Amino acid sequence: HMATLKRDKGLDNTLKVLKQGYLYTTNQRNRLNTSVFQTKALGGKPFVVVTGKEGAEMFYNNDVVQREGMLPKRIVNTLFGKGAIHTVDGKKHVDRKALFMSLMTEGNLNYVRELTRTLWHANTQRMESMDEVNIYRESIVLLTKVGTRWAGVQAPPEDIERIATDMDIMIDSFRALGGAFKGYKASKEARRRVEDWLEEQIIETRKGNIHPPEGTALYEFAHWEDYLGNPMDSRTCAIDLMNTFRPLIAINRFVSFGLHAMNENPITREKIKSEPDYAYKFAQEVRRYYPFVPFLPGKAKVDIDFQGVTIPAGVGLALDVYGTTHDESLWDDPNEFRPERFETWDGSPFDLIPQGGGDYWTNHRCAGEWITVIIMEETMKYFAEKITYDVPEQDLEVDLNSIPGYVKSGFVIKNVREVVDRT
Ligand code: HEM
């Protein structure tokens, strides 16, 4: 019958995972000479790490994989929220996921494109006026304006900076993989403030005291009823409403990385300007190449025969996101930033998985992938075409051994000047 699963042995390898970061799984495959291995982590719990197209296709087979209950409790407490869409499976999930996906119309996607473009255009003067601009921060603030407006949440200009900071702390809060860390309680408090704020909007909308536009997240979520005819309770509704735009705000990570790429590979700036298709390819290449999501947790519902081993019923599963997006058999020279690779990509649901794999409607795949690519296209076109700027000496390192993925400096620019033909 099948072979015995190889192990990264140890009672609990969480510390070792954290020390090796986005390279943990590749390091283990390499040293064990295997495509699939088991490790215990998160308090002695076994997880079988799977990768590649075959790992992704199996991970998103709902007949054999459970996702409910597999996120670390602390990460639910800070990043996603109690009872969030990420936390449910089966009919309850498909029903609620349809609500998220219903927002992703052609018009709403066009709207997010236009918002992003207008706000960057409107921000030029501010940025010229600054001695230096930390792109990670400036983009998170700008994207807070985009995301709240797109979601139909009215956010007073005077609150945007605090909101952005709260979002930042939440987005960062997967850094310990569910373990204790110094910043955990601050992350919880950020979450409580943002949940309280949104809950009030939901209640006021349901009472008829405010009138968000039809088709926005706030409107649609406040009024939605599940397959049994019941609304979300107000707190859960606020939680899932946040899940429509916190991750939009999180695109600031990719904005920073994109400017990093454009800096390291200056030909890409010229190509963004010259080739209309190229900004899309560039955006896709940022998502593939840079680290953000390391892996995703699930559980085997039944014994699964996979790549010559048997994965036992009840054991954890970890889909390797970083490893799949850097798989040398999927991506020629996976550690080269090369937007042109997208000229030949067939659109598979199972290779380009930085925001999950599988199906939008029946799997837990990111609802916001289209938005992410849109926002990145517009933002990179802006920085490539609309302004010039200098990049001072700074710490540009992206440490692959440290979750979460960041440019150490945030990516700082100076001497911003609008590009204007005045002749
Ligand atoms: C900034 C970059 C983003 C990253 C790296 C990202 C990544 C991910 C990943 C890895 C998942 C989980 C896939 C799985 O569990 O199988 C996910 C789920 C989700 N994403 Fe994103 N995402 C991003 C942006 C967005 C945007 C912009 C939105 C909304 C506008 C969004 C909404 C969601 C939702 C609602 C889910 C949960 C779907 C479900 O559980 O069925 N994401 N995302």
Author numbering: 0 to 422
Paper text:
Among the best characterized of the CYP152 family peroxygenases is the industrially relevant OleTJE (CYP152L1), first isolated from Jeotgalicoccus sp. ATCC 8456 in 2011 by Schirmer and co-workers. Crystal structure data show that the active sites of OleTJE and P450 BSβ are very similar, with the carboxylate group of fatty acid substrates being coordinated by a conserved arginine residue (Arg245 in OleTJE, Arg242 in P450 BSβ, and Arg241 in P450 SPα).
Crystals were obtained for both the H85Q and F79A mutant P450s in complex with arachidic acid substrate, as well as for the WT OleTJE in conditions containing formate.
